[PDB]
Amino acid sequence: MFVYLSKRIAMPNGVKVTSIAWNDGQGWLACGGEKGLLKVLKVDGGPQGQRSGGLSSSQTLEGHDTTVDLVTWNQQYCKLTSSDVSGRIIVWVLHKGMWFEEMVNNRNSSRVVDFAWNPSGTKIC
């Protein structure tokens, strides 16, 4: 296989990126950055967005305070899961191109390390 650079995208404010997750369902790419930065792009994976690398949509998300570090997807229901250094875990649901917060949790005692979806997409660890 051949790997070649095709595109560089600079997120706003020049903040170091710490968590990247791509959704198989529709091409929703997620990016996390320091000081509670959460970004979601939509890149078209079809031939229109293949040769040109079409960045179809952009959306900045908020609700995190510390550096976003753990981001994961769920393709069947197209759901997102996010965390931060503080320990705030947020699940995001798509609705008309708007990512609504669905649940916020915080153990307030330990740092969350990683997420894990079952291959069926019904359980989260």
């Binding site: 595109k7 560089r8 600079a10 706003p12 404010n13 020049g14 952009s58 900045t60």
Partner: protein
Amino acid sequence: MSLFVVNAPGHEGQLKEQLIVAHKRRPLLATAWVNPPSVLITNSEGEVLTQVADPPGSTGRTHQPTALTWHPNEELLVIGWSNGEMSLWSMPSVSSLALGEDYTTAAARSAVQLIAAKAATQSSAEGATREHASGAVVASEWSTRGLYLVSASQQRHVVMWMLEKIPAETSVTFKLKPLWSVQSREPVARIIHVPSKDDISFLLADGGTSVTAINEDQQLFPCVTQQEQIASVLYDAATRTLVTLTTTSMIEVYAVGEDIKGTSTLRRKLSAPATTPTVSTTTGERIAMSMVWASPGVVAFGSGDDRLRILDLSSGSLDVLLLPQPDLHVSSLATFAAKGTMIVGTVEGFLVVFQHHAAATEASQWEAMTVHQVGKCVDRVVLTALGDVALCCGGSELQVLHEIIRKRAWDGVAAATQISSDMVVIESITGCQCLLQNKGNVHGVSIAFPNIALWNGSQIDFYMIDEATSEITFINFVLTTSPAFAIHREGLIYVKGNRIVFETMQLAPIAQMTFTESEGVPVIMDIMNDYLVVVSSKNYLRLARISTRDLQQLGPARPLTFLEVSVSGARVNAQGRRVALMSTLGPLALPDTRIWVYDSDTDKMSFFDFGSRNE
């Protein structure tokens, strides 16, 4: 022929000639004034829409705007001040107001854009002062698709900005966020953008010897290299051509490919003599170099002399097309690609308008249509979306010239002629020649002697002449906005809303039946003797006969068969049977070379063209 109407939105502030900008598609225009430092945003007719100052928080430091740029498709302006603060002026869209759906005529759109501009907003980009490090924004530029912005300051700081359109719960807001903070060798003067045929890549020129581009790789690299100082760089996106005229007036045309590298194709020595040069001592500055894109493939420049120098990049031929007179010092230049028209501004106070022949010798293709002597030295010339031309006169002075045809009329007793924006000469066959001045500009003239009605857009004033004393006095106004109005011995017939209102001199209603949207809004009307013709906005033709009591419609509404071809004027004969029709071409109100005749008896529409006569 035709003339400009000159509207000057009055302000005693010192206008900056370098800071008048026009939205390329929406008909708006922004100006920056000093003492007081402020920004007047007006429509395309010079009518003030809003006035903008520093957003609140200032401790008396009313900062000075230094750069204004438009959004290429939205009604959005961004202003770089003297302190590096980057403000953003946004008017709410009409469709966001959720009002009625009848807003499709020009006047209603003007009124709603006026009230929305009064309901606009100003926002501040966060941290923009720090990124410029309290440096005045000497330049800014949007991308071709208008979602990347670049701001360059006098501290050589160049910052790229990403545009985020946030749909609010009841409106739409916008934000501009910094991406990079790079440095140039000098304060960059002009920033240009290159499209790929979206792609983010901006050329930068500081007025030195070499131009520096920057792309998404965050690298500032030169494209063309010259050993002499450059002043202005012309970019053609369709051919990607980059034309540079040196400070010594040397031609350097570079073909630029995808590698962002300029390759010279034509560069020939031009011998401009230095025998007693006319150094600009009246202004105390170097003479401004002037070149713009005259035509696809052809570039014009005026050297500040009495001559105009055209250069055909297709054949490499440079020639001169002279003005009708000698002794004309060209100061600024502009060109309208929609009509193929160049606007030549002179220090003496002349505007010369050159028209494409297709809109022998190649230089004969351009020809000067109108010479308008404004009588004041022009600083900068900026065209608008519709073709209206704004001028900066005397530094602190601004004018907006809108091109119209001269209104005139001939009732049978006296002829009325328009000679200025608001001066009208009325002259009978009895020698009763007198001049009258209006409060506002002249937009419509109708005469039924001695009653004479003039429409100034917002209203019509009908004046009475007492020829026994030869005294003329305003009496009362009819506040309507339609271009359709015509006075008669029986009364005045105009359009209020959908209704076509017939009244007396004391405005006693005569005919009143409400029209519908299917019948539409009449735009054109003609009165002569006892016959009237009405043309709506949907090509509908209604002949009518006016009598002492009623308006007997001679038959139903009729359509006519001809981008699209509209109707701008109609005149009916004394039998009330044949109607002469003036057509236009395209939404730009371009004149048409053929004229139309509708006969109601046979209901035919014949025509005769004048392009066969080159007329």
